Symmetry: C5
Subunit: 315 residues, 5 copies
């Protein structure tokens, strides 16, 4: 039941010989052990096509201050909240986001009688991702980032643990999210790794991108069965060809810009456009002076590519 | 009728033994009760398609400072405005917007003779929303967020109330907005839950989504009654099929992404496309030469989808 | 002809018993009168379709400091420039933009011998607008916001005047701008109201939005006078309908998010698409088993709508 | 060869009776003369269609501090670098960008033995521009802005000079950039006027726009020299009409907004559309059963517009 | 094995006669030598079409503080981490990004017993690039930036070295990146010149602009060898030519904005069009009153352009 006056007197006289610039140890030749417990709360996913996933994480850093220990016999307080600029706290940062991460300290530290210190932090940053889009829509992403100390190497401060959990609502929207994190020993200090794996789901909206690949397909075989007596055919074919190539342009603006392998949808569209153009050329050449063969080739190639797509299919 | 000199003296000598880092209580073993009165002022709606609603709220925090009580006998001032960095105030935040909420303190606190303190705050944040598009064009959105203390748990500071009102303009902008908020007890402290539910008002701007379905329904059913003597029947069937599939492609781009269940319009149109394609395939197979039974069943399937669509109709 | 040393001596000893947190009045029970002179400098109009106009205004606040009066007999200075953080100034803000307006105090206050103080401020904020699109593309907007004190109510500080002017270059670019501003008495203090009225010009570039409609009108009535012999008519028409319904979606994207009345362009496009669909159905049923009648109906409806548009026409 | 110790001693005792809030003059009734030397380094051009050109400029302000003069007899230092918050420097700003210019001071001031002070500044601001698109694609723009003291009027501080230069790599791509600079005298003190004139280059990619102008020209002339025996002439004329109007729309989507006058190419294509439609309706009348007059009118108008276009043609 | 108390005592008494505004030299008439070691970590190339590449670099500045030398005999500390606002550090900046680079000092400095000081910095800035489009899609970019001291010239501070390395993952993604950096001597002090060269990799996705040309080429050369007896030849030529105009319009939207040369592919296409259209004209006009000649010229010039492209062809 500590009253205001004694908490005031304590706060006046509990950092007497304390310098927040010095790691709180009785022997400074050894590292200070900091534990981390991380929770991935949300993902943005806006620029995931360009290779950047904007995620938010919550950290609970825990360490031991060996200079701010007291006992209730003299100060009947079991714990306190102390601002971040009054005592030593470690500065953490993640690779490739130093300049685009505001890092405003707003959560005070919580310090116990025996020196245990807990600090709350939240990071909102881009984690770069590598895209495997051979099967599209069902692209797969792998992401990685490393947390490190802003000022301390392995001989000055070390991550004693690194655990990650999830809010259970990461994978609720069009992603299978699987994470793993553990502490590594980097060249310039102790690092905490964080690896994410995102696998797109089978949403109807994502599969709508297949319909164009259907349309042209129909239109393609639909050049064959037309008024061959009329020259309209060649013109019609040309028209289709144009549309197809234009669509490919628009298509390239959606595909993950840089995949480990070329997506099969693009190859199918290229094949269809090439076949339509050659069909127009062939019909006009015949008019100057194959059907079943063209249909057989189309069927063979399309079935091979669809079989590959089924092979790479996920559920 | 306090003059400038006596208010100057009071301001000089009214925080003598006061530390703003300490909750203003005479017994600190119990939580400080903070009451909140909230008003949802505006909505953005821009990114509601992605699943984020950007709202602005005005908060009136009210608590009791037990160390700044005075009486008019010695200080003829009934109330004062004192800056946010002179006396203790609680820092509030909302889930999932810690790192994208500027939180600039610009309104001073108002303190009465007996310690009653009122503070004004304004938050402008993204409240994540979940979309149900079963009845699209009309969609339903549910949004939720929680307010919490940056620094205090249930044993150090508690929300004694949580009330919300509106500006009477949220309803006007093409949305039925209904909200409900109350104080909860979370795992890590007292929380203020705020829940929003947005339905979409009826607009004549949804003939854009009704007309195509009606016209395509009529065209599709009219394929049965044609100059069946003419082979053009299969031509009409194919052209209608392509038109339907192109419409599917266009439509799928204006449905919400994270839809809980597939919208009914999509099912109606995709089934109509299936029907027309089956009709064309049957016509061509007959020309070159179970189908009828399936078509008969299909019409019933469309009747089922249309009944579900009308059952979910709003006003 | 005051020298550096006497201005130095003055600046050292002219805020002796002054607290910038107190209103500079000899009797603090009465309000402090602050006069405002505003000027709308520029408009953005980028997001005006979404219902937000971004304007920049210049303010000249003028009040009387009843505690910093001096006379040239002792200090040969007629006036001074004193930084904003040395003497009391009122904090002003506007509705619905508290969280997205960066308060950078960069202009010093100008204080005369008799206490008159002038301060320069510049605000850059969104002002929400209500749209009327009954006549489109010649849409009309009404916008409105209020200025208020951050920290003072009617019994503490009051706007003694509120006057606005314009830079004369507001209406030079595709808008007729009319403004009006006066001081009101709000529930929570004195308010300064600012009302804008924007009316779009007749820019011939804007008129191209009517060009697509004309394309269809032609194609539409260009369905009857064709090689009807070729049942394909049905097909051409179905193409037309598809095109119209793919346009209408983009147009709905273009239209103002919400209008007090439904724009006529949308209704006309809906009618044209409907007529095209019925034309297809009619040719189909006729082939299973009007031209001049269809033309008369189209002419009547179009003339009625254009007559309503001309009735609503302004300038 | 001044050592560390004597520079330390100098820095300690060279602002003894110096207030940075007072203009450094021995007679403060007269203005302080500040000289400016500006260099336009880069332009952004991204929003130049909307009328905003984002430019970066480097300023070297020069003035004379009459209170920080010393001689090497007592302080063997010829010049020093002193931070911006130790001595008086003038605050400069530009019109219509006060709220969207960071204005971070990062370059120290260079002060010589006799008081001459040089300061570096870099502005990155939008400068509103007026577009003249009569000649398209060779559109031309004019921009202007003014620099002014944040805190001083003509009787307290004046610009003694205002010179400008370019970066020598400014007009090297797609623009003929010209500049002018002079010291005006407004109602709120001395002003520094900066005027820019941008003229688009003759990049052959832009000349691609002229290809359609000839195509649709060829097509209109071509309508007459065809198998007029076939009534299809109506169909072909309607086709060129529809294509021309569709183009007109697409091009209008490219023309700059708020243009001073309607571009010539727009009128050319409008008249070509009119000619095509007139020919189509004339052929329809012929089928129902002025030609040479229409051809003469069209040739005259098109040749007049082309002569004009080529008259303004640059290079 | 230094304990907390002696490090506290050291930090209290190791900046006794130190001014962080003074370069840490014993003879200040000579420059202070600062070494740099740079690493381009990532690049964004989102706006690379506009000519701006956004790269992130990591710097390790190294210099010698001649005033903070101590020895272990009195202070058993071999090195220390000291904040950036306790001792002198140089301010570095790069050309043309002063106003769009946050520059937050977050990494402390590491100082050794003998005065060697290291500092960590990270810059995230745009580096302007020049585009060569002669080989399309295999465009080549050249970029350059210059690092300099915010406050020091060649007689006050100098870059003793300037070395750059790479993270080895720059070129992993659709770019050949080759850097080079060395120190220069500019007119405003020592400079660090950084040069980049980007050359797009030869993918298959970047070979979908080959097919549209090739096919078109054939089509264009297939206008001559046709059933010339059939007058429809001219109609097919108009169809292909309209396709050509549409494809030219599409392609003009993909080229880099400001290329030094004229993209060869764009040339090929536009020239093929103009000459084929002239051939069709020639045919119709002559009938109103060459084929092989136009085919020969088209082949000659198209092959000349293709060879000109193959010349610079990369892999
Ligand atoms: C320093 O003091 C702190 C708190 O005074 C100690 O931490 C607390 O230690 C107790 C056990 O001594 C923990 O109790 C256990 O908590 C878990 C919750 O995960 C619960 O499941 C168990 O049934 C049990 O109640 C308590 O959680 C823990 N709290 C915190 C915040 O750490 C710490 O152990 C002391 N260290 C030393 C070296 O004395
Ligand atoms: C501490 O002092 C404050 C103000 O001096 C007290 O708050 C005020 O309490 C009075 C009643 O004592 C309230 O009067 C009532 O106001 C309501 C408005 O809802 C009105 O409908 C009633 O007819 C009556 O006039 C007054 O509103 C209220 N004002 C504020 C700003 O809180 C507070 O009760 C005092 N606390 C204690 C423990 O004495
Ligand atoms: C306190 O002192 C200030 C400045 O000495 C007084 O304001 C000034 O008052 C004079 C007249 O007393 C004004 O002169 C007039 O100015 C207008 C411009 O609007 C001009 O058109 C007239 O011909 C005449 O010259 C002067 O403008 C005005 N200046 C300012 C900045 O307010 C103020 O009246 C004094 N107040 C008291 C209570 O004595
Ligand atoms: C106060 O002292 C400063 C520097 O100590 C003087 O500025 C410098 O003045 C000298 C002449 O006294 C200038 O020398 C000339 O420089 C030009 C460069 O344009 C050169 O072409 C000539 O051959 C000659 O060397 C020097 O440039 C100039 N430097 C600067 C940075 O301004 C200033 O004149 C003194 N003022 C008074 C009132 O004594
Ligand atoms: C001032 O003290 C610092 C550190 O005490 C000295 O820097 C260090 O100097 C030693 C040699 O005296 C270097 O050792 C060598 O390091 C290289 C790594 O490149 C290694 O390959 C060699 O086998 C050898 O171990 C050490 O690297 C170096 N460290 C740093 C961070 O620079 C510095 O030389 C002293 N200055 C003077 C003037 O004595
Ligand atoms: C949900 C409360 N939340 C977010 C509002 C995060 C939090 O404690 N989750 C958490 C963590 C971080 C680790 C393990 C287990 C759990 C449940 C509080 C918070 C913590 C640090 C910084 C900011 C907020
Ligand atoms: C409209 C005035 N307004 C916004 C300009 C908000 C305000 O009082 N509404 C309100 C609240 C917040 C609670 C209950 C009842 C009402 C009417 C003032 C304000 C309050 C807090 C923070 C910022 C501004
Ligand atoms: C044009 C000079 N200008 C803008 C550059 C604005 C200014 O005085 N016009 C003004 C105002 C604000 C009210 C009434 C009458 C007039 C002429 C100076 C300025 C004023 C306040 C803040 C920033 C700049
Ligand atoms: C190129 C060096 N540069 C830009 C990196 C600008 C500079 O000296 N050009 C300059 C100026 C500003 C006026 C007249 C003549 C010249 C050559 C240095 C700089 C100057 C001021 C502010 C920031 C940087
Ligand atoms: C990978 C660690 N990293 C980035 C996390 C960069 C780093 O040491 N690479 C580096 C440099 C900068 C120069 C030479 C050799 C190497 C390996 C540390 C770092 C350095 C400066 C600023 C911030 C972080």
């Amino acid at each position: 039941c500590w009253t205001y006056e004694e908490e005031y007197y304590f706060r006046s006289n509990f950092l007497q010989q304390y310098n927040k610039d010095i790691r709180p140890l009785n022997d400074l030749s050894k590292p200070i052990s900091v534990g981390i417990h991380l929770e991935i709360a949300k993902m943005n996913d806006f620029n995931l096509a360009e290779g950047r996933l904007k995620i938010q994480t919550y950290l609970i850093l825990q360490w031991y201050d060996e200079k701010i220990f007291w006992n209730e016999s003299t100060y009947p307080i079991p714990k306190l909240m102390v601002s971040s600029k009054k005592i030593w706290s470690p500065a953490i940062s993640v690779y490739y986001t130093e300049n685009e991460m505001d890092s405003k300290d707003q959560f005070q530290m919580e310090i116990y009688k025996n020196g245990s210190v807990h600090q709350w932090k939240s990071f909102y940053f881009n984690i770069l991702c590598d895209v495997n889009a051979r099967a599209f829509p069902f692209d797969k992403y792998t992401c990685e980032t490393m947390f490190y100390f802003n000022d301390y190497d392995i001989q000055t401060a070390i991550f004693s643990s690194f655990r990650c959990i999830s809010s259970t609502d990461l994978s609720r929207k069009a992603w299978y999210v699987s994470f793993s994190c553990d502490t590594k020993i980097g060249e310039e200090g102790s690092l905490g790794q964080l690896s994410l794996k995102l696998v797109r789901k089978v949403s109807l909206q994502c599969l709508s991108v297949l319909l164009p690949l259907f349309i042209f397909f129909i239109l393609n075989i639909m050049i064959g069965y037309l008024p061959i007596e009329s020259g309209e055919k060649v013109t019609f074919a040309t028209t289709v060809f144009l549309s197809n190539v234009i669509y490919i342009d628009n298509l390239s603006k959606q595909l993950p810009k840089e995949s480990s392998e070329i997506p099969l949808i693009f190859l199918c569209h290229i094949f269809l456009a090439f076949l339509s153009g050659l069909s127009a050329v062939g019909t006009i050449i015949t008019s100057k002076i194959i059907l079943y063969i063209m249909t057989f080739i189309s069927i063979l190639c399309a079935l091979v590519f669809t079989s590959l797509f089924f092979e790479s299919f996920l559920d």
